[PDB]
Amino acid sequence: TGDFVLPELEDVRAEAATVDTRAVLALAEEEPAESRAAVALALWEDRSIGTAELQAAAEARCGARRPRLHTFVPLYTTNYCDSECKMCSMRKGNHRLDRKFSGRKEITEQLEILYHHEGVRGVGFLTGEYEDKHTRLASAFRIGWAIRTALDLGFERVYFNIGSMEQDEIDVLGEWIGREDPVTMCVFQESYDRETYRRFMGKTSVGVPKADFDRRVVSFDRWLDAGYRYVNPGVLVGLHDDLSAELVSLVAHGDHLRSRGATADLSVPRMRPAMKSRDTTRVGDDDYLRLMSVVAFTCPEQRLVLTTREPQEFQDVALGLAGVISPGSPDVAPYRAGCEARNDEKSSQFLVADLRRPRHILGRIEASGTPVDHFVNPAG
Amino acid sequence: GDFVLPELEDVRAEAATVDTRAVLALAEGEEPAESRAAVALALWEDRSIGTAELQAAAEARCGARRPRLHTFVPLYTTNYCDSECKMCSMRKGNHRLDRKFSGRKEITEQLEILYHHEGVRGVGFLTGEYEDKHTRLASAFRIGWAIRTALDLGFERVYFNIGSMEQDEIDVLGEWIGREDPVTMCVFQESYDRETYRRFMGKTSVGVPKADFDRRVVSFDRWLDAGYRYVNPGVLVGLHDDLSAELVSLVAHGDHLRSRGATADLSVPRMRPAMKSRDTTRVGDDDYLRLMSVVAFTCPEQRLVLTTREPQEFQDVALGLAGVISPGSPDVAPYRAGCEARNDEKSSQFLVADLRRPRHILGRIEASGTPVDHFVNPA
Ligand SMILES: C[C@H]1O[C@@H](n2cnc3c(N)ncnc32)[C@H](O)[C@@H]1O
Ligand SMILES: C[C@H]1O[C@@H](n2cnc3c(N)ncnc32)[C@H](O)[C@@H]1O
Ligand code: MET
Ligand code: MET
Ligand code: SF4
Ligand code: SF4
Ligand SMILES: [Cl-]
Ligand SMILES: [Cl-]
Ligand SMILES: [Cl-]
Ligand SMILES: [Cl-]
Ligand SMILES: [Cl-]
Ligand SMILES: [Cl-]
Ligand SMILES: [Cl-]
Ligand SMILES: [Cl-]
Ligand SMILES: [Cl-]
Ligand SMILES: [Cl-]
Ligand SMILES: [Cl-]
C-alpha cells in the first residue's frame, strides 16, 4: 500500500482527450487541471502543436529554475553483472567483455582525477546488478563506502546506479551517509511496459535479478521509506516502440514521487552501440526533442538529465530542456589526468557519442552563457 | 615455488630412521637431523613414549618462547556462504540458517565492544567462501576495510579467515594494509587427504568454491608472493580417521612456510556440534593432546592456536602447548556489553564448548600465571 502503481493507459488516454492543449501551453510559471500524465500525453499526441513550439514552451516553463544546470560525471566501479539485459554489453552472457573491478586505490584515484583535473563536484557510481543476497549486500557496502569517500573529498552531489534495492540493501548503503546528504538513487525502469521489459531484461525465477520488474519499480519507495529524498527514474528510449506509453508511465512515476515529497531527476537516455543480442529501434532527433519537451514542460521541477550518449550537436540543441548535464564514459576507471577518457568496446557498457573531456564540454557550455553548478573550471 | 603435499610413504620411510629418544633429548635450540614431518610421525607412532612424556617435552621445548601467549577474538562478519562443507552449519544448502550480514555500523560497534568491554587488542574477521569472481572481490574489499578499521582503532593483531584467495583478491584486500602490518591470513586445509576433503567439501565444478583443493592449498603461497608474512594453516580434527597422515601434512606445510620466511601459527580445531550433512569422528582427549604435543614439539616457533571449541577443563590442561588463545563465538556480531556473547544454533557456524566472556577467560589465565599479550583486563 502506497508504492507506485503503473497508470492504466486507457484511462490516461480518456483523460488526455479532455485536455485543452493550447490552454496548457498558455500557462505561466501554474498547473493544468488534468493530471500531468494526461497532459503530457495530450501534448505529445496533438500534432497541430509542432515540436519547435513545444520545445520553446518547455524551455520557457523551465527557464526560471535555479541553478539552470548542474553536473555529475559517471564512474563505473566494475563491469561485472549477474543480469542479462539484451541491449547492454555488461550482460552476463557477453563472454567477450573484459571484466574489471576497482578497489580502494583505483576508486580514490579516479575521484581525485575528476575533482582536480576535470573540476567537477558531482559524481555518480555504477555497478552491475547482482543475484544473490550476499553479493547485493557486499555491493551496497562498497558503493556506500565510495559515496562517503566522495563526500569527504568535497563532492557536493553523488548519484548511484547499482540496481534495484531492497530494504536491507538500503540499510547497508545507508550506514555510510546521512538522510540529508546530497545522494540520489538512480533506478531506470528502462521500459514500463511489462512485455517489452521481459523481452530485454528476461524472465523471473531463473537467477536474472533485473527480470523482477516489481522489485525494480518500487526501489524508490523503499528509499523514501528509509527517509531519503533524491531519486532519478528513467526510460531507455529505443526499447519500446510506443513512446506515448513510456511518457505516460514516466510522468506518472515522477508525479507519484513528488507526492511522496521526493526531489526527482528524469532520465530519457537513447540507445547507443553495444554488444547487444536483441533488436532496438532508433528514435529520431525531432521526436526525441518532442519527448524531452513534453516531459520537461509537464514536470517543471524535475530536471531532465542529458548525457554524452548524445553528440555535441544534439547537446547544443537540447541543452535548454535539461537541468542536469552528465558527461563521461561508461568504461571502468577510464579517466586520466591529462587526456580524454577511455571508452573501449571490450570493457564499456556502450559507446558514447561525445568523447570530449568533461572540463571541455562544461567549459564550452559556460562560455556559451549557461553556468554549470558543481563545475569549477580548472583553468580558473 | 608453491607447497607440494608430501608423499606419505616417503615420510614413513624417513620416520623409521628417527631416533625418537634422541629427539626428546634435544636442547631448546636444536633441530633434529630428519625432516620435521618424519620426526612428528615417528614421535606420534612410538607408543613407548607416552603422551604425558611428549606433552612435557613439548611444553619445555616451547617454554622459552616470548610472548608466551597472545590472544585474538573471532568476529564473524556474515554467515552467508556459497560452499557446501558438510560439517558446517553455514553450508549454502542449510536452508534453516538465519542468514546475517554486518555493515559498517555493526562491524564498528562490535570492534568497539571487543576493545572496550572485552579488553582485547586482537581480532579475526571471518566470512563464507564465495563462488563468483565479483563476489570474492567485493568480500575481499569489505574485509580489507574491516582490517584497516581495526588497526586504526588500535588492534595490534588482525587475523582473517575468508576462504581461499587468488592473486587479484589479495590485491584488493592488500590495498587496505601495508606489507609490515600485523595481519595473518588463515586458510585451514581441513583435511590434506583429497578423498576425505572431497567427501566433506564436495567435488570440483558444481559452483562449490572450497571444493578446489589446490586453489585453497596454495593461498598462502600467493600471500607470500605478494610480500606478506603471517599465515595460519590448520587441520579439522575429526574429518580424516588417520591422524598420522594429517599430522604429517600440516607439519610439512608449516615447514614449507618456514622455508619461505613466513611466520606461521598452526590450528588444530576439533569438531563441534553443527547442522551437518555428514557425520564426523570424535577424537579423544589423549590422542588430541598427543597430536598437539607432537606438532608443538616439532614446530617450536609455530604457535598452536587453542579456541573455545574446547571446554575450560581442556584449555587448562592444554594451555602450555599453545601460543595463541582465541575465545569467542562463531555467531554473527554476537558480542554485547555486560553479557556473554550469543551463540545461537540458528545463526552460528557451530556450538562452542565455552561461553565465558573473553575478559574472564583471559583474566583467569593471567591470574593463574600466564600473561596474555593483546589483552588489557577491563576489570
Ligand atoms: C545506466 C543506464 O544505461 C542504459 N543503457 C543500457 N544499455 C544501453 C545502451 N546500449 N545504450 C545506451 N544506454 C544504455 C540503461 O538505461 C541503464 O539503466
Ligand atoms: C573456521 C574453521 O572452523 C572449522 N569448522 C568448520 N565446521 C566446524 C565445526 N562443526 N566444528 C568446529 N569447527 C568447524 C573449519 O576448520 C573452519 O576453517
Ligand atoms: C550499468 S546499468 C545501471 C545499474 C544496474 N546495472 C541496473 O541496470 O540497474
Ligand atoms: C567460516 S569458515 C572459514 C572461512 C571460509 N568460509 C573457509 O571455510 O575457508
Ligand atoms: S543494464 Fe545494468 S543490470 Fe542490465 S546487463 Fe547492463 S549492467 Fe547488468
Ligand atoms: S567451512 Fe567456510 S566455506 Fe565451508 S560451508 Fe562453512 S563457512 Fe562455507
Ligand atoms: Cl544559473
Ligand atoms: Cl545475456
Ligand atoms: Cl527474478
Ligand atoms: Cl541518464
Ligand atoms: Cl544504437
Ligand atoms: Cl539469445
Ligand atoms: Cl542522454
Ligand atoms: Cl554519461
Ligand atoms: Cl610472556
Ligand atoms: Cl583455530
Ligand atoms: Cl574460534
Q: Which domains does chain B have, with CATH numbers?
A: 1-379 (3.20.20.70)
Longest dimension (CA), chain B: 58
Measuring CA to CA, which residue among A211, A218, A220 is closest to residue A186? A220
Contact (CB, 8 A) for A308 and A354:
yes
CA-CA distance, B141 to A106, in Å (whole number)?
12
Contact A142 B144 (CB under 8 A): no
Enumerate the known binding-site residues of B. 76, 81, 85, 87-88, 112, 116, 190, 210, 216, 272, 309, 349
> Looking at beta carbons, which residues of chain B come within 8 Å of A137?
78, 101, 103
Contact A134 B104 (CB under 8 A): no
CA-CA distance, B347 to B128, in Å (whole number)?
13
Residue B205 CA to chain centroid, in angstroms? 26
- Enter the C-alpha cell of residue B221: 603461497
Q: Which residues pair with A339 in a beta bridge?
A: A336
Enumerate the known binding-site residues of A for S-adenosyl-L-homocysteine. 76, 87, 190, 210, 216, 272, 309, 349
Residue linked to cell 556502450: A350
> Looking at beta carbons, which residues of chain B come within 8 Å of A176?
104
Task: Name the percent of chain B in helix, strand, coil, to the closest 5.
Answer: 40, 10, 50
Contact (CB, 8 A) for B268 and B291:
yes
How far CA A161 is from CA of A58, A100, A196, A233, B267, in Å, comes to 27, 17, 21, 10, 43
Is residue B321 lining ligand 6, measured as CB closer than 6 Å?
no
Count CB atoms within 10 A of the CB of residue A22: 11
Report the interhelical angle of A104-112 vs A133-153 (nearest 10°).
Answer: 40
CA-CA distance, B192 to B5, in Å (whole number)?
8
Burial class (CB in 10 A: 0-12, 13-18, 19+), B198: middle
Report the interhelical angle of B133-153 vs A104-112 (nearest 10°).
Answer: 80
Rg over alpha carbons for chain A, rounded to the nearest Å, is 20
End-to-end Cα distance, chain B? 49
Pocket of ligand 2 from Cβ distances under 6 Å? B 87-88, 161, 188, 190, 234, 236, 269, 271-272, 274, 309, 349-350
Q: Phi/psi of residue A312, each to 5°?
A: -50, -45
How far CA B321 is from CA of A117, B118, B315, in Å, comes to 59, 24, 10
CA-CA distance, B142 to A114, in Å (whole number)?
24
Residue linked to cell 610439512: B252
3-state secondary structure of B122: strand
Give chain A as a 3 state SS string: CCCCCCCCHHHHHHHHCCCCHHHHHCCCCCCCCCCHHHHHHHHHHCCCCCHHHHHHHHHHHCCCCCCCCEECEEEECECCCCCCCCCCCCCCCCCCCCCCECCHHHHHHHHHHHHHHCCECEEEEECCCCCCHHHHHHHHHHHHHHHHHHHHHCCCEEEEECCCCCHHHHHHHHCCCCCCCCEEEECCCECCCHHHHHHHHCCCCCCCHHHCHHHHHCHHHHHHHCCCCEEECEECECCCCCHHHHHHHHHHHHHHHHHCCCEEEEECCECCCCCCCCCCCCCCHHHHHHHHHHHHHHCCCCEEEEECCCCHHHHHHHHHHCCEEECCCCCECCCECCECCCCCCCCCCCCCCCCCCHHHHHHHHHHCCCCCECECCCCC
Chain B touched by A214 (CB under 8 Å): no
Q: Phi/psi of residue A304, each to 5°?
A: -75, 140
Alpha helices in chain B (DSSP H): 8-15, 20-24, 36-45, 51-61, 104-116, 133-153, 167-174, 194-201, 213-217, 219-225, 243-259, 285-298, 312-318, 358-368
Q: Which residues pair with A286 in a beta bridge?
A: none
- Report the b/e string of A61-96 with b at 16+ CB within 10 A: bbeeeeebbbbbbbbbbbbbbbbbbbbbbbbbebee
How far CA B35 is from CA of A361, B21, B252, B298, in Å, comes to 69, 16, 8, 9
Q: Phi/psi of residue B201, each to 5°?
A: -95, -15
CA-CA distance, A294 to A151, in Å (whole number)?
34
End-to-end Cα distance, chain A? 52
Chain B touched by A133 (CB under 8 Å): yes
Q: Phi/psi of residue B306, each to 5°?
A: -115, 130
Helix (H) or strand (E) holding B186: strand B183-186
- Enter the C-alpha cell of residue A290: 518532442
CA-CA distance, A250 to A236, in Å (whole number)?
11
Is residue B121 lining ligand 6, measured as CB closer than 6 Å?
no
Q: Which of B130, B135, B145 minimises the CB distance to A145? A: B145
CA-CA distance, A354 to A306, in Å (whole number)?
12
Q: Using the mean position of ligand 14's atoms as its centre, give its distance from the Cα of residue A192 in Å.
A: 22
- Enter the C-alpha cell of residue B209: 568454491
Pairing of strands A303-307, A183-186: unpaired
